[PDB]
Design a protein around this ligand. Structure first.
Ligand code: PMP
Ligand code: PMP
Ligand code: MG
Lengths: 414, 411
């Protein structure tokens, strides 16, 4: 609309490319809005005041609803006291106690801003702890956008990641072999708790893979690092490997544990405490109290309320509804990963032209779904939201069938 | 006091060493409180409700006073709309226009969280722009706590910084020599706008040094990056090298441009725009609107009010007062760098025993000063605050003289 077009014209002049990073719409159909005006519960409004039921949950942070009144009350109370001060607030202690108490593997916490801050801290910690160099990551796994791990390597030197080595996710043989390929020199294994990457089907972690990670780390003294920045608190009320009976040495957390306030965390066992004290990591904003107050109230709600069961039920209902609509319209889906963090692709759609068209058509019905990145459910998504969503998705399936002969892949994608 | 001691005991159990990073009190005298309860204007209150006139300004962020009412009203207005959303707020555009408008060398802005995010982005951008490897930094200059730049190297590999090379700050010949030592391979020169580092006297940047940096960059196509995360908006209303007449290609900003709200920025000229589009930098929280709304209002106040002149006047008064006071007591100071971001050391105090004792004695008088790290003035510090500060500093000078024979360095 008129406001979006003005904003895009202006943005291109003063922001490289008009926008950047994971929230850029550059690889989405052109009808996706870039700039928003407001948000509440499970909904966002674009600059032209069109509402969307939001299945990105702000790319993860919106766990409980935008402007959730209890979290905003806790943030308000802390803001009357102080935020970014010469030292941390006393409540930093309360937050570390609360987080450590919830995470069975952890005896301590460190707070930072970005999830990338937490994964980088984990990497440096493991090198200090072991005196070894090699960090093992799954090929194509996203752990942040630092030089060591950013997925797109313009301006990145080989030397920035020369001591990162790779294994195939969910392949126990591949991981075992990676330990032996750098025999005696493994500082850490990083693993996301499931496979959650762009343009790729999701897949749950396999027990044998997770056991092999834990066993090889135990045998060698390497630290097991679960990167829970994305899945944290939508799989479980603890580390997302809890249900596999596999406890890491370090876990990284972010996005949603203050329901949108900027704070991330490294949780660590006592095994790793000395190395955590030896490294030097910090930032201007890492000791700010208002995000910590929001985190304390979010963690309370996580502990004390059926938020998790609620958002999973909404996810499951959406999944079932799309399966049924899929069969009716003759357009097979691949719905993968947990229903509460779903990847929803079309079968037999290798250039994504079908998925792109369908996602764009859902916008016209007031639904924001994503053709290449996993989605997310919030505890604020209602049974009514899901019913209304499925009316939009029905029409989107019809629009894709109607326009099927004229569909084109995204040019920049191509 | 009692609450501080309970908190340190509890902290030790659930946080490595009870605290970490630049706000840890580990290297300060033991009477420095680690944990605080509240903050307002130029004052902080510790966990035992003792007020201090605060000369750290939260280590830079507090430019206009804690809980500054206009910035909080602007933050409130945005919070009723939305903060961390599926895309940025429309106000991201307003913020970029405002920041670009204020910064003469800049045509575009990118926003992030940490100052370290901005400096890292500048590094990657320069390598993408030039296709070269070597980043030149001043020996001992702090640009963040990433693997490539962190000052303490536990867990850091040689390979993390093998393409960072060093020059001597304020030494034009050293910088020129460093270009030639990596001939045709310089991606960027990073410089803080003055020397501002721990345990060291500060020094203003020399014109010939800055001109050399600009000229060597111009000749080689390397990018000149001014790291203004610390000094930004306390030296000038533009890049802190504005008074030298030297414009960088990139400048890095953070700490105070949203008066405590967490947001940082890379500002760049069109020369660097293509490379800025080519690199991939992002974060979950980098597109949040409320820090951007605080930033817009902070930047307006910076442009439209005499905040700079106010904090400079306060810094100048404090410096002249301490000069006179120290001389009366026969204890010479080294007050270095800008008066509004002062380093206050004692002459002939190589193990900091005197400065530590003095700084500790200031706490008893309700004044928070730092014996090894530069301090900061805010526009909320008043003439009466300086007068009251000087009463406490006087007593601290007397305390140091009384206990002089017994002073011991920090363990
Ligand atoms: C000049 C300079 N540059 C970069 C940084 C990094 O900022 P942050 O701590 O917010 O990551 C700092 C922080 N002291 C700084 O002083
Ligand atoms: C699993 C995972 N780890 C780390 C990060 C990095 O977090 P941030 O973008 O907040 O720096 C992300 C962000 N997508 C993530 O999904
Ligand atoms: Mg625990």
């Amino acid at each position: 609309g008129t406001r979006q077009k003005d904003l895009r014209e202006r943005a291109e002049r003063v922001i490289p490319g008009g926008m950047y990073g994971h929230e850029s719409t550059r690889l989405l159909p052109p009808e996706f809005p870039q700039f928003f005006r407001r948000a509440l519960g499970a909904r966002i409004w674009d600059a032209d005041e069109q509402p969307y039921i939001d299945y990105m949950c702000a790319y993860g942070p919106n766990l409980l609803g935008y402007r959730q009144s209890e979290i905003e009350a806790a943030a308000d109370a802390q803001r009357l006291l102080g935020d970014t001060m010469t030292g941390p607030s006393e409540i930093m202690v309360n937050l570390a106690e609360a987080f450590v108490g919830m995470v069975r593997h952890a005896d301590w916490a460190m707070f930072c801003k970005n999830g990338s801050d937490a994964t980088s801290t984990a990497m440096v910690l493991a090198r200090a702890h072991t005196g070894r160099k090699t960090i093992l990551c799954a090929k194509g796994a996203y752990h942040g956008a630092s030089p060591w791990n950013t997925p797109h390597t313009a301006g990145i030197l080989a030397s920035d990641r020369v001591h990162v080595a790779y294994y195939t996710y969910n392949d126990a043989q591949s991981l075992s072999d990676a330990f032996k390929a750098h025999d005696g020199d493994i500082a850490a294994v990083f693993a996301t708790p499931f496979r959650h990457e762009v343009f790729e089907d999701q897949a749950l972690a396999q027990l044998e893979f997770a056991r092999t990670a834990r066993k090889c780390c135990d045998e060698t003294g390497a630290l097991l690092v679960v990167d829970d920045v994305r899945a944290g608190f939508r799989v479980a009320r603890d580390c997302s490997w809890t249900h596999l009976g596999i406890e890491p040495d370090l876990s990284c957390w972010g996005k949603c544990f203050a329901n949108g306030y900027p704070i991330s965390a490294l949780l660590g066992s006592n095994k790793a405490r000395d190395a955590a004290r030896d490294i030097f990591v910090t930032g201007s904003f890492w000791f700010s109290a208002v995000p910590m107050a929001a985190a304390i109230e979010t963690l309370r709600i996580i502990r004390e309320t059926p938020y998790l069961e609620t958002l999973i039920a909404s996810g499951a209902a959406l999944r079932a509804g799309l399966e049924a609509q899929s069969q009716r319209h003759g357009l097979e889906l691949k719905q993968t990963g947990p229903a509460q963090m779903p990847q929803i692709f079309f079968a037999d759609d290798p250039d994504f032209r079908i998925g792109y068209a369908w996602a764009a058509a859902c916008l016209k019905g007031g639904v924001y779904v994503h053709p290449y990145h996993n989605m997310f459910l919030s505890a604020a998504h209602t049974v009514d939201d899901v019913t209304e969503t499925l009316e939009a998705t029905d029409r989107a399936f019809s629009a894709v069938l109607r326009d099927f002969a004229s569909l084109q892949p995204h040019p920049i994608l191509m």
